[PDB]
Amino acid sequence: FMRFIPLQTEQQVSCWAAQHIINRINDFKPTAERPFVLGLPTGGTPLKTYQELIRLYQAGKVSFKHVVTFNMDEYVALPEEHPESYHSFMYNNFFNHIDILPENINILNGNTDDHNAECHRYEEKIKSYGKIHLFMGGVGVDGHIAFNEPASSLSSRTRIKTLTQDTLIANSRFFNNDVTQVPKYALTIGVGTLLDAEEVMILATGHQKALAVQAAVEGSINHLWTVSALQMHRHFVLVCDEAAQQELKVKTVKYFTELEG
Amino acid sequence: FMRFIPLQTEQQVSCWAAQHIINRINDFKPTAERPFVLGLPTGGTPLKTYQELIRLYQAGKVSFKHVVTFNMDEYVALPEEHPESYHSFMYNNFFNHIDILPENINILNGNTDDHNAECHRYEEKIKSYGKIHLFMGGVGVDGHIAFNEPASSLSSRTRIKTLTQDTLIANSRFFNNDVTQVPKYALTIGVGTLLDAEEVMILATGHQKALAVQAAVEGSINHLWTVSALQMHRHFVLVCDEAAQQELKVKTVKYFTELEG
Amino acid sequence: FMRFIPLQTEQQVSCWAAQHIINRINDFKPTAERPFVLGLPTGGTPLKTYQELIRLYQAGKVSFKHVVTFNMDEYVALPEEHPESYHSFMYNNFFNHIDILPENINILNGNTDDHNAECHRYEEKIKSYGKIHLFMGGVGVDGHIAFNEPASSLSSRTRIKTLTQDTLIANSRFFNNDVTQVPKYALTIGVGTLLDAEEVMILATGHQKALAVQAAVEGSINHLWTVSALQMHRHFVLVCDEAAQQELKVKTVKYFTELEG
Amino acid sequence: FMRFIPLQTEQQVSCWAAQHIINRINDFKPTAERPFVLGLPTGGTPLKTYQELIRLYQAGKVSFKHVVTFNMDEYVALPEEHPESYHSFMYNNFFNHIDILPENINILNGNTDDHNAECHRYEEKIKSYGKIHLFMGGVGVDGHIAFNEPASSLSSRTRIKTLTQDTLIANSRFFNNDVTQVPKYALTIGVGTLLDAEEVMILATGHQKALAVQAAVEGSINHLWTVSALQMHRHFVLVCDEAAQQELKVKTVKYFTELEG
Amino acid sequence: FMRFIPLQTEQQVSCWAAQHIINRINDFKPTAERPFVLGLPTGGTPLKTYQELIRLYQAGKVSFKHVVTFNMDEYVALPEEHPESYHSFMYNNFFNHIDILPENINILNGNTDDHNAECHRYEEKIKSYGKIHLFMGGVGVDGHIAFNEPASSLSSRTRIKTLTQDTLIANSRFFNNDVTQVPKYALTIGVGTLLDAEEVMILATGHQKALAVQAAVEGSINHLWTVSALQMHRHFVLVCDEAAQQELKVKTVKYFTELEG
Amino acid sequence: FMRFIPLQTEQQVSCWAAQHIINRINDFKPTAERPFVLGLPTGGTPLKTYQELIRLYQAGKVSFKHVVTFNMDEYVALPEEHPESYHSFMYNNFFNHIDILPENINILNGNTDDHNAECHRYEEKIKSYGKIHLFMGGVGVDGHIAFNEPASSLSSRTRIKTLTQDTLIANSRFFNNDVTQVPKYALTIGVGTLLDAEEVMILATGHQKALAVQAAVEGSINHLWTVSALQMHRHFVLVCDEAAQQELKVKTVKYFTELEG
């Protein structure tokens, strides 16, 4: 069944998420021949989690020497050494501070000569390892996942996507508030790619995600709220802060707070 | 306009109600010529409030030597010394334990020769005092007030009412679970009579009152939920326990919890 | 406050309305100096009601010798002896079969030299009688009243109105299915005119009126459903057939069906 | 796919359910080697059906000499000869009045030394017969099935469950209205166990089940209403009384009333 | 997954649908041994599309010399040469004006001696060709498909159906507005038959279809709205006019309007 | 009753508002003895209107000589010459560029020795002129008006208000993104003060105001959405851009778009 973890502060969400990733890896006991495969996102709430994971690694609570990562997405036609590329985000905020092997980091390359070939290569790389064991991600204010469109097929695969006007505006702040400077296209994993993971953990902090949280927990599966499709996943975890609880009914928070005791 | 007091336990609800009545009386400074006029109901939750008022009176925190009371209702064709009459409920559980003057207790007489004249005398008696300063009451699971029907006119007056099938069944527990023994009619104040008070305090405890609480706080005015009409009252107070908050949104409880402190 | 009469067939709706008009007249005991003032509409369901009223008059159960009528509306620039005028509908189907005095029939004149002057004369005529005691009417699928727009001011008065595209289409069947032949304008009473009546009885038969009936009975007051504003009227009666109850909940019909019996 | 049978009285509900069970058995024509497997619940609503089933047996309209029964649940650490055990409920109200073979009655044993082993033995016993042909059951006010929590996996199996505070409160009436006297744990079939039956008949009587019936018939599949998951079952039957129809739309009751007869 | 094409006029809807059928056929490049298989409906909106298909054929933009058609339904016990039979509708409005081979026209025969045998023969004929490549259809005001009941199993097959009271009334206009003159039964494809097609194009024109469009586009899958089940189809296309958009939210139309351009 | 003006761009919203203010003043023909009284707010969309009003003044299309203004609010314990004070906002962006007389500019003083006396003088000053002829304002994301709380009494008066946590965060961007630097309290007009104006024009631009616009146009009056109470105002105007329409139904936008043209 769906696991809903209602918490109060964004730090508690990040600390909980990091702890969950630690426990799965440490229970899995990964080796070189049998690595743990981790799906990873970008953004503000992930950032706090990566920071917590670095702190836990600096202690003696985890090693990434046998963790393989796959990232959700990357901009197209943007140099991968650009400060605002998703390559740069991952290496600067995470991979450069942990003991992961450089050949176990997978991030879509948006500068290939053939974007379809690159997307198929990504899907193949995942299959070569078997399956992603834990995919961490976020959710949009409209319930969309990664750069997938809000009404995306639940069996969509990794493909090239044209960024929406709203996505262009949202990300403008990373490119000098210039909509014309945001890359028009990106490579993203599909909803099917996400659903193929053994466990999907979605992190939702902020009042702007409260409607997405209501759709995920209280609503029925709606094909206009991609996050609601995770209700059909065998292990769907949703962690949220108090601001994102504001649209739920009192009985909903009561039920899940007490279940998690 | 509307004050919503969300509390946890039924005990806290009665204590809050008792304290509020104390403060209203003690601020008002009643005299014999200028008494404080209190509207009073019957039932389980009021009983706890009357008990707390008695304890506060014994603690010399209040005197009723200048409080005039009006009760909501009384059965018709039931001897007023019968255990299950509302005369008996009020005197045995409250008036016989406080310093109220016997001539300041007003309760509808359901044994008159003329129920319309009796109801009219009651409305006149209130007018002779000016106005009820604080009317305490409860609310039905369908939002009805006193013996008024769930679709009662917002200008209904004191009148005779035929008890509903649900009310007959509900009150059967007081007459040996015999529907045939519950009085068929009762004299009740109208919704207009209630709204004419200077302040209306409604007490709502129980999971069975959660939908009525949602209608009063979150919903628009609906003529099928009489309690919602109190939204237009100049001083409408609603006190409720945890079980009755369960249908509200987290943001609704949050807003009013913080306002009151 | 609101009376809802849920019936099965359109015949039952018409008979109930006729009986109600009969009973109001007979209780009022009208005289020449103090006549009973009746507001009247046109249409299919009214036709059956007028037929039933004629039968009751022939059965000497009522006299209209002291009833004054005001009609809702009339086409502009249509000869008043034209078959499709509302003058013709009223006289041919009703007034020519009863004992009403010819000088007590009031119908807006859509052939005046000054429609604003004409509309003002109509409002003045009504005030000269005091108030309409019972106004019968229908309701549009969008809850609109007469030729008033669905968002009409609740204080709109009798005025000239440009017929909507939907009203032109609906009424084409009376002019050889030719939208170009329907009069473009009409003189209509306002929503304020309707609410000034002592009692408003609206008759709603048909599956296409089920949403309007739901808005009037179950919904809160919405200014886009003019019929719902009648919830705040002192005597609002709504009579409907089974097809018009299909959007209501079983509890709504149960409460009112048992109240009326 | 889904059959909804709306009736008026609890007697009609029990009569319909009993007849359906009769018809399935008699069509199946069970033998000793190929028995009919019947799943059975506990509670007030089942009781009337069991009484009706006894009467139909007395009327020689059915024989249980070749029916094998499996019950949903039983208390743990309560002697099975205790008046309030479900063993006692089934035997006193049903099995002691019909011709079932004593070795064909299966009820979870809450007094074993190994509750997991007992639960597995129960699932195995079902497997040994093939599958349950008809599972009769009730529904909680929150749509839960048997002792499963409203957030149980739709593939949950027979297991030990800690009774919720709500179930403890509900069941206090059988243990002197004392929450501390209700057994803390119980053995219950899972939602998966129920869904593995060839047909599921849910019985819903009472005003307190109106919201649950709305969730099963009118709502989409919601993972917080276990009863709504039965919409995906190949043969889902829901029988309900008039009090449980109160939250449905008139069009829903109309549709199914006409379809079923 | 789901394609929603919001257009303005009914003409544009039929023109779009015709063009889509043309393009599917021309890409498929059908041969006699490998024909293109087309599913076809009856009604007002299909009529305009067939007219456009005839115009495009005269313009030599398409040939049906290798198109095989299957129709949704046909009346029972009505001579197939009757003006109001669906045989007549299809031949008069379509087949008599195109170059389809007469042995490639498939329409259920409601005059067989064995309606179950006929329905199985129809299902078998579809199987003999493999699958329907494109199924065009309409939608009822309650979201039902063909003569399937609004609560039909999503795996229903071609079968005989008793026409509902509402269906009898709707079709009365073709039989002298006499409910008793409409055939009581019809042969119809099942919902499973429709879902087995490679692509399903539903056409929805009219204000009376706006609620069904909202259920298909905005709502979750509801087993009382058959059209909503098409959300789970691999290629579901819904084309509608402005009147059918009136119940959608502005953001819904905006999203899909921009997607298609 | 209520005018809803749906437009596309924020420029059009400000231009319409300015034009409306122009036309009201010019029709009124104000003199020194009989001035036009204008209520004014602060914020981004108002600023664009003030620029347009200055442009219209430079074009000699209006004079503000005989115009008296009243502002909604002002911070307390902030020097009125501070860049971020509302005194500074109004003078720098409006009053210093028009021909208003310095003795006709009214703005609450948040630096008085007695804020209650200060509030009363403000209400009295309004009464001394008679009534505000046109009050322009904005609306919060929760429908709140000025610094009034979202559940404010509809008869609240000018008073001191403690800024909510949300208001502190929102305005932090004007004080170096420092919540601790935003003044804790503010002087604000009450909801009653707004309703006492002869006309209320609310301007709503932005996707974050779409829910407030839906509450004002489509919803019933809710005491938790202050803007919805303006439905009972004699002349309530709401102007909005395309981003703020996104939550309305297509039929709502269609109706009012056609009404205004």
A237: tokens are: 């975890």
CA–CA distance, C125 with C131 (Å, rounded to integer)? 10
Burial A183-203 (b: 16+ CB within 10 A, else e): bebbbbbbbebbbbbebbbbb
CA–CA distance, E8 with E5 (Å, rounded to integer)? 10
CA trace torsion A124, A127, A133, A136 (10° rounding): 20
CA–CA distance, B242 with E6 (Å, rounded to integer)? 48
Q: Which of B259, B194, B197 has its CA nearest to residue B24?
A: B197
What is the DSSP-derived secondary structure letter of residue E261?
Answer: -
* Residue C146 neighbours by CB distance under 10 Å: 24
C208: phi then psi, degrees, rounded to nearest 5: -75, -10
Strand partners, A36: A67
Q: Which of F65, F158, F54 has its CA nearest to residue F105?
A: F65
Q: Which amino acid is at E152?
A: S
List CB contacts of B51: < 8 A, sequence separation 6 or more.
B14, B93
List CB contacts of F229: < 8 A, sequence separation 6 or more.
F154, F191, F195, F221, F223
* Residue B240 neighbours by CB distance under 10 Å: 26
Whether residue F2 and residue C151 make contact (CB cut-off 8 A), yes or no, is yes
Which helix (H) or strand (E) element contains residue C110? none
C186: phi then psi, degrees, rounded to nearest 5: -150, 155
CA–CA distance, B120 with B187 (Å, rounded to integer)? 11
User: Cα angle vertex C15, ends C10, C18, to 5°?
Assistant: 125
What DSSP line would sit under C156-180, residue for residue?
A: --SEEEEPPHHHHHHHGGGGTT-GG
Catalytic-role residue among D73, D74, D196, D241: D73
Elucidation technique: X-ray
Burial E150-187 (b: 16+ CB within 10 A, else e): bbbbbebbbbbbebbeebbeebeeebeeeeeebbebbb
Q: Which of B107, B123, B112, B210 has its CA nearest to residue B159?
A: B123
Whether residue B151 and residue C1 make contact (CB cut-off 8 A), yes or no, is yes
CA–CA distance, D119 with D123 (Å, rounded to integer)? 6
Tell me whether D221 touches chain E (CB under 8 Å): yes
The H helix count followed by the E strand count for chain D is 8, 10
List CB contacts of D83: < 8 A, sequence separation 6 or more.
none
Lookup result for tokens 């209630």:
B194
Q: Do the beta carbons of residue B123 and residue B190 sit within 8 Å?
A: no
Whether residue D259 and residue E152 make contact (CB cut-off 8 A), yes or no, is no
F102: tokens are: 């310095």
F210: tokens are: 């779409």
Rg (CA), chain D: 18
- Residues 135-164, chain B, touching C (beta carbon < 8 A): 149-156
Catalytic-role residue among E73, E118, E196, E241: E73
Lookup result for tokens 């997607």:
E259
Q: Do the beta carbons of residue F160 and residue F185 sit within 8 Å?
A: yes
Q: Which amino acid is at D13?
A: V
Helical ranges in E59-113 per DSSP H: 86-93
Q: Which amino acid is at D17?
A: A
Whether residue D250 and residue C250 make contact (CB cut-off 8 A), yes or no, is yes
Q: Which of A220, A252, A256 sits opposite D220 (nearest CB)?
A: A220
List CB contacts of F172: < 8 A, sequence separation 6 or more.
F178, F179, F181, F182
* Residue F9 neighbours by CB distance under 10 Å: 12
- The nearest alpha carbon in chain D to E220 belongs to D220
- The nearest alpha carbon in chain B to A245 belongs to B250
Per the structure, the count of domains in chain E is 1
CA–CA distance, D16 with D53 (Å, rounded to integer)? 10
Q: Computed from CA positions of residues D118, D120, D122, D124, in that sequence, does the dihedral angle turn out positive or negative?
A: negative
Tell me whether A219 touches chain E (CB under 8 Å): yes
Q: Which of F64, F62, F66, F84 has its CA nearest to residue F74?
A: F84
Lookup result for tokens 């105007």:
F237
C-alpha distance across the termini of chain A, in Å = 16
CA–CA distance, E4 with E7 (Å, rounded to integer)? 10
CA–CA distance, B256 with B237 (Å, rounded to integer)? 12
C17: phi then psi, degrees, rounded to nearest 5: -60, -50
Whether residue F223 and residue B255 make contact (CB cut-off 8 A), yes or no, is no
Catalytic-role residue among C123, C142, C242, C247: C142
Cβ-in-10-Å burial (0-12, 13-18, 19+) of C254 comes to middle
Q: Which of F150, F152, F222 sits opposite B220 (nearest CB)?
A: F222
- The nearest alpha carbon in chain E to F242 belongs to E250
Q: Which of C238, C239, C187, C226 has its CA nearest to residue C15?
A: C239
Strand partners, B75: B186
Q: Do the beta carbons of residue D212 and residue D139 sit within 8 Å?
A: yes
CA–CA distance, D112 with E235 (Å, rounded to integer)? 55
Cβ-in-10-Å burial (0-12, 13-18, 19+) of A235 comes to middle
Helix axes F44-58, F86-93, angle to 10 degrees: 30
Q: Which amino acid is at A202?
A: I
What is the DSSP-derived secondary structure letter of residue C102?
Answer: G
CA–CA distance, E2 with A154 (Å, rounded to integer)? 11
CA–CA distance, C66 with C28 (Å, rounded to integer)? 11
Which helix (H) or strand (E) element contains residue B126? helix B115-129
The H helix count followed by the E strand count for chain C is 8, 10
List CB contacts of F218: < 8 A, sequence separation 6 or more.
C224, F248, F249, F252
List CB contacts of E43: < 8 A, sequence separation 6 or more.
E138
Q: How far is D80 from chain A (nearest CA, A)?
A: 30
For the question of residue C142 being annotated catalytic, the response is yes
Cβ-in-10-Å burial (0-12, 13-18, 19+) of B59 comes to exposed
CA–CA distance, C135 with C36 (Å, rounded to integer)? 11
Probe site for chain D from C8, C248, C249, C255 (most D CB atoms < 10 A): C249
Whether residue E1 and residue A154 make contact (CB cut-off 8 A), yes or no, is yes
Whether residue A220 and residue D219 make contact (CB cut-off 8 A), yes or no, is yes
Three state DSSP letters for chain F? CEEEEECCCHHHHHHHHHHHHHHHHHHHCCCCCCCEEEEECCCHHHHHHHHHHHHHHHCCCCCCCCEEEEECEEECCCCCCCCCCHHHHHHHHCHHHCCCCHHHEECCCCCCCCHHHHHHHHHHHHHHHCCCCEEEECCCCCCCCCCCCCCCCCCCCCEEEECCHHHHHHHHHHHCCCHHHCCCEEEECCHHHHHCCCCEEEEECCHHHHHHHHHHHCCCCCCCCHHHHHHHCCCEEEEECHHHHCCCEHHHHHHHHHHCC
Whether residue E246 and residue F246 make contact (CB cut-off 8 A), yes or no, is no
Q: Do the beta carbons of residue C134 and residue C21 sit within 8 Å?
A: yes
Contacts of A245 in chain B (CB under 8 A): 250
Q: Computed from CA positions of residues D68, D74, D76, D77, in that sequence, does the dihedral angle turn out positive or negative?
A: negative
What DSSP line would sit under chain A, residue for residue?
A: --EEEE-SSHHHHHHHHHHHHHHHHHHH---SSS-EEEEE--SHHHHHHHHHHHHHHHTTS---TTEEEEESEEESSS-TTSTTSHHHHHHHHTGGGS---GGGEE---TT-S-HHHHHHHHHHHHHHH---SEEEEE--TTS--TT--TT--TT--SEEEEPPHHHHHHGGGGGTT-GGGS-SEEEE--HHHHHTSS-EEEEE-SGGGHHHHHHHHTSPP-TT-GGGGGGGSTTEEEEE-GGGGTTSBHHHHHHHHHH--
Contacts of E250 in chain F (CB under 8 A): 245-250, 253
Catalytic-role residue among A73, A74, A199, A241: A73
Lookup result for tokens 């059906």:
D49
List CB contacts of A130: < 8 A, sequence separation 6 or more.
A37
Strand partners, E105: E69
CA–CA distance, A71 with A105 (Å, rounded to integer)? 8
* Residue C25 neighbours by CB distance under 10 Å: 21
CA–CA distance, D29 with F243 (Å, rounded to integer)? 67
| List of chains touching E (3+ CB pairs within 8 A) | A, D, F
| Strand, coil or helix: B136 | strand
For the question of residue C133 being annotated catalytic, the response is no
* Residue F43 neighbours by CB distance under 10 Å: 14
Tell me whether B2 touches chain F (CB under 8 Å): yes
Whether residue F245 and residue E247 make contact (CB cut-off 8 A), yes or no, is no
- The nearest alpha carbon in chain E to F218 belongs to E249
List CB contacts of C122: < 8 A, sequence separation 6 or more.
C70, C106, C108, C158, C187, C189
CA–CA distance, E144 with E72 (Å, rounded to integer)? 13
The contacts found for F110-115 with CB under 8 angstroms, 24 or more apart, are: F110/F74, F110/F75, F110/F76, F110/F77, F110/F78, F110/F80, F110/F183, F110/F186, F110/F187, F111/F76, F111/F77, F111/F78, F111/F79, F111/F80, F115/F76, F115/F160, F115/F187
Q: Do the beta carbons of residue C66 and residue C36 sit within 8 Å?
A: yes
Q: Do the beta carbons of residue E126 and residue E193 sit within 8 Å?
A: yes
Q: Computed from CA positions of residues F124, F130, F136, F142, in that sequence, does the dihedral angle turn out positive or negative?
A: positive
| Distances from the Cα of A8 to the Cα of A13, A138, A195, A257, angstroms | 8, 17, 28, 11
Helix axes C86-93, C44-58, angle to 10 degrees: 30
Q: Which of B259, D2, C168 has its CA nearest to residue F149?
A: B259
Contacts of D5 in chain E (CB under 8 A): none
Strand partners, B186: B75, B161
Q: Which of A246, A249, A253 sits opposite B247 (nearest CB)?
A: A249
Cβ-in-10-Å burial (0-12, 13-18, 19+) of B131 comes to exposed
Contacts of B245 in chain A (CB under 8 A): 250
* Catalytic positions of F, written as ranges: 73, 142, 144, 149
Whether residue B154 and residue C220 make contact (CB cut-off 8 A), yes or no, is no
Q: Which of D83, D73, D66 has its CA nearest to residue D107?
A: D73
Maximum distance among all Cα pairs of chain C, rounded to whole angstroms: 53
Q: Do the beta carbons of residue B127 and residue B141 sit within 8 Å?
A: no
Q: Do the beta carbons of residue D119 and residue D24 sit within 8 Å?
A: no
For the question of residue A149 being annotated catalytic, the response is yes
Whether residue C151 and residue F221 make contact (CB cut-off 8 A), yes or no, is no
Which helix (H) or strand (E) element contains residue D67? strand D67-71
Maximum distance among all Cα pairs of chain D, rounded to whole angstroms: 53
Lookup result for tokens 């006549």:
C35
Q: Which amino acid is at C55?
A: R
β-sheet with E159-162: strand ranges across: E73-75, E185-188, E159-162
Contacts of C246 in chain D (CB under 8 A): 249-251, 254
Q: Computed from CA positions of residues D126, D129, D135, D137, in that sequence, does the dihedral angle turn out positive or negative?
A: negative
Q: Do the beta carbons of residue B191 and residue B233 sit within 8 Å?
A: no
Lookup result for tokens 């069991």:
D50
What is the DSSP-derived secondary structure letter of residue C221?
Answer: P
Strand partners, D67: D36
Q: Which of E79, E132, E141, E83 has its CA nearest to residue E106?
A: E132
Q: Do the beta carbons of residue B244 and residue B172 sit within 8 Å?
A: no
Range of the domain at A52: 1-261
β-sheet with C134-137: strand ranges across: C2-6, C236-240, C200-204, C134-137, C36-40, C67-71, C105-106
Lookup result for tokens 């498939």:
E106
Strand partners, A239: A5, A203
Q: Which of C190, C159, C185 has its CA nearest to residue C77?
A: C185
Length of chain C (residues): 261
Strand partners, A204: A240
For the question of residue D149 being annotated catalytic, the response is yes
CA–CA distance, D220 with D6 (Å, rounded to integer)? 19
List CB contacts of B202: < 8 A, sequence separation 6 or more.
B136, B137, B138, B139, B216, B227, B230, B236, B237, B238, B239
B159: phi then psi, degrees, rounded to nearest 5: -160, 170
Contacts of D247 in chain C (CB under 8 A): 249-251
- Residues 234-253, chain D, touching C (beta carbon < 8 A): 242, 245-251, 253
C-alpha distance across the termini of chain D, in Å = 17
